[PDB]
């Protein structure tokens, strides 16, 4: 066949590029940063009404000041999260301090290219790249509120707002306009809820959608259905308001 | 399916093409050689062709001294020849160390033959494109010639020839023995056995040789050595004064 770590004539790694395709099919995930905190929202997307929607975990806590949302082959993200949590915890054990959000991100990205069938450079054991992207949101004393997009390519970017998943391209264009450096957490919450609503096949309710945020004071928290339902309602009213 | 021609696995006819092609490469050098057994010595002749003028003729050889007693001439590309030579030398040293006596020519031949047999069965090892002729004067078997090939095959000979024109040299020798009725050259001195060798090499190939057209090795009781251009010239001058 052809090695899993081969280059295309255009200078790209086949397996990584294809990896990106699988992610385009994933459920929508959106993150928005504001000087008041960072909001992280995702599209549950149950494959049947018999599926208890709350058993759908696509937003997880890495540390008290770091959480992330995933999109793509989500089973692949388990080891990623495990590594991430261990890194945050370990850094605390070794330095008596919280891990910087960027470092945590870099740490996760370092696993990314660790695949192959015998790549000369160390001992990269993992037959294929991960098929899932992550939005890592958190806060640290050095650069405050931050939002990161980490891909199977091993690269990561910092964003003020970012959307990944099936509805991404459209949602990103949206964010491109909607976002401005003076948004409040509440405004961010509604904006996420709004864009999710627009790109979701399903009618957004507090069962097929989920919100969460990270703030210096209370850290990373996942909004429970009730809290989100009201924000959804509050949104319908403001929209119909004009 | 058609890869049964790239690695050492069976073809539907039960053949190993890679082993067949390795044999093909043994003629790359376009050099012939022959070995004969004396009354108490063994001689190996090999053509020497150094066309490039920039080459140092003295560093061009296909005859090796595996040990004080064993000599080896190779028909095939030089890098595989040297690989086989190095290995044999190691095998011979090791054998002496472990068993307390000089490794016999036939045993070294078998050991190398077995090593080749493996490249024939294991997929990642390619056969070596060479045929090895081991010679010596065994302390038990006397004058000896054992030759091995890319197939892992090997056997002892009364005399033997190898190369593009191996057949001509062989039938020449076959004839000589059918006549003499003995399995060796009834000659006391090796100088004369060397002359016999060169003479028949000439008859068989229908070619005359100068002192730089040949390479000669001689094995006697407790010593294998190779002749110099001069040692050869003397040999050549000798055959001249008979024709």
């Amino acid at each position: 066949d052809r090695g899993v770590s081969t280059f295309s004539p255009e200078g790209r790694l086949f397996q990584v590029e294809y990896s990106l395709e699988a992610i385009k099919l994933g459920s929508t995930a959106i993150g928005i940063a504001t000087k008041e905190g960072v909001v992280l929202g995702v599209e549950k997307r149950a494959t049947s009404p018999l599926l208890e929607s709350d058993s759908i975990e696509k937003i997880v806590e890495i540390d008290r000041h770091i959480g992330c949302a995933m999109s793509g082959l989500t089973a692949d993200a388990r080891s990623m999260i495990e590594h991430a949590r261990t890194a945050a915890v370990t850094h605390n054990l070794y330095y008596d301090e919280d891990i910087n959000v960027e470092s945590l991100t870099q740490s996760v990205c370092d696993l990314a290219l660790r695949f192959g069938e015998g790549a000369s450079g160390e001992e990269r054991l993992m037959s294929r790249p991960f098929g899932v992207a992550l939005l890592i949101a958190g806060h640290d004393a050095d650069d405050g509120y931050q939002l990161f997009h980490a891909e199977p390519s091993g690269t990561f970017y910092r964003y003020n707002a970012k959307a990944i998943g099936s509805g991404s391209e459209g949602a990103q264009a949206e964010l491109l306009n909607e976002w401005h450096s003076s948004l409040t957490l509440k405004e961010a919450e509604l904006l996420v809820l709004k864009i999710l609503k627009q790109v979701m096949e399903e009618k957004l309710d507090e069962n097929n959608a989920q919100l969460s945020c990270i703030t210096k004071q209370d850290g990373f928290k996942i909004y429970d259905n009730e809290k989100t339902a009201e924000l959804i309602k509050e949104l319908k009213e403001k929209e119909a308001a004009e | 399916a058609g890869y049964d021609r790239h690695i050492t696995i069976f073809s539907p006819e039960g053949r190993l093409y890679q082993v067949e092609y390795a044999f093909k490469a043994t003629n790359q050098t376009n050099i012939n050689s022959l070995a004969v057994r004396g009354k108490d010595c063994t001689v190996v002749i090999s053509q020497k062709k150094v066309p490039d003028k920039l080459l140092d003729p003295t560093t061009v050889s296909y005859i090796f001294c595996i040990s004080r007693t064993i000599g080896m001439v190779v028909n095939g590309p030089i890098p595989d020849a040297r690989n086989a030579a190095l290995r044999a030398k190691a095998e011979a040293a090791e054998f002496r160390y472990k068993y307390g006596y000089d490794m016999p020519c036939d045993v070294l031949a078998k050991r190398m033959a077995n090593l080749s047999q493996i490249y024939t069965q294991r997929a990642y090892m390619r056969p070596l494109g060479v045929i090895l002729t081991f010679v010596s004067v065994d302390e038990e078997l006397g004058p000896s010639i054992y030759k091995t090939d890319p197939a892992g095959y090997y056997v002892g000979y009364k005399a033997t020839a190898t190369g593009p024109k191996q057949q001509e040299i062989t039938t020449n020798l076959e004839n000589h023995f059918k006549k003499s009725k003995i399995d060796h050259i009834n000659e006391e001195s090796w100088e004369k056995v060397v002359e016999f060798a060169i003479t028949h090499m000439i008859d068989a190939l229908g070619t005359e040789f100068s002192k730089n057209d040949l390479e000669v090795g001689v094995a006697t009781k407790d010593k294998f050595f190779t002749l110099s251009a001069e040692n050869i010239e003397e040999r050549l001058v000798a055959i001249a004064e008979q024709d």
Binding site: - | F10, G14, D106, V155, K158, F177
Partner: protein, 250 residues
């Protein structure tokens, strides 16, 4: 470097055939004929010494090998493969038996060990099956005389008499006609020589024929005297002279 051929080179084809084993068998058919005949007081294995050159020395290359002092082997197919199998067989007879029980293994078991080695070459990663079939004849105290055939697949079966190689079909038929459960060793050696004659084209003499037997114990071949219970090997390769003397009464 490092063998990266950790996968099987012999696999099942959609029709259920194991290609490499088949091909290996083909190679065996192309091989020189070799046979074996079991008598009441011995066994005999024989083959032709297809000298690959008149300058070669047929004696320096034996196709009939002693495995233990009461077991011999002969083959058809790839000579080099047989040579290493013979070494492995002689070794396994020690490491897996004589070094444990202090006695040489019984024919069936050694045969079984050999077969295993071949079976593995049919499934292990990065190798090809052995291109040979063997005929092992031996004798052990509790099983008397026996004759076995081992194939490239690793299968083996006991025989009263059989042949493998080039003219196996014809030879097997000739043997079926001449074999009976009352043959004495001399009778089997005779029938052996007759059977081999049909398969041979040119010269047929003690120098072109290789034949060994498993019969009585040869105290005279033991090498030492003084131990009553030790009586000598049952395996004995016939001499060129012995073969010729018999060819006269052929």
């Amino acid at each position: 470097m490092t063998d990266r051929y950790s996968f099987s080179l012999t696999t099942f084809s959609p029709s259920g055939k194991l290609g490499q084993i088949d091909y290996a068998l083909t190679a065996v058919k192309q091989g020189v004929t070799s046979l074996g005949i079991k008598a009441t007081n011995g066994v005999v294995i024989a083959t032709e010494k297809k000298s690959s050159s008149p300058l070669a020395m047929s004696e320096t290359l034996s196709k009939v090998s002693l495995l233990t002092p009461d077991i011999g082997a002969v083959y058809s197919g790839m000579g080099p493969d047989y040579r290493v199998l013979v070494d492995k067989s002689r070794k396994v007879a020690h490491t897996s038996y004589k070094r444990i029980y202090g006695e040489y293994p019984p024919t069936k078991l050694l045969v079984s060990e050999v077969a295993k080695i071949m079976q593995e070459a049919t499934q292990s990663g990065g190798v090809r099956p052995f291109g040979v079939s063997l005929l092992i004849a031996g004798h052990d105290e509790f099983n008397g005389f026996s004759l076995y055939q081992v194939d490239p697949s690793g299968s083996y079966f006991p025989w009263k008499a059989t042949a493998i190689g080039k003219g196996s079909v014809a030879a097997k038929t000739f043997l079926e006609k001449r074999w009976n459960d009352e043959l004495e060793l001399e009778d089997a050696i005779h029938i052996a020589l007759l059977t081999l004659k049909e398969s041979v084209e040119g010269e047929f003499n003690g120098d072109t024929i290789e034949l060994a037997i498993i019969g009585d114990e040869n105290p005279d071949l033991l090498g030492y005297t003084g131990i009553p219970t030790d009586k000598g090997p049952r395996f004995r390769k016939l001499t060129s002279q012995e073969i010729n003397d018999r060819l006269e009464a052929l």
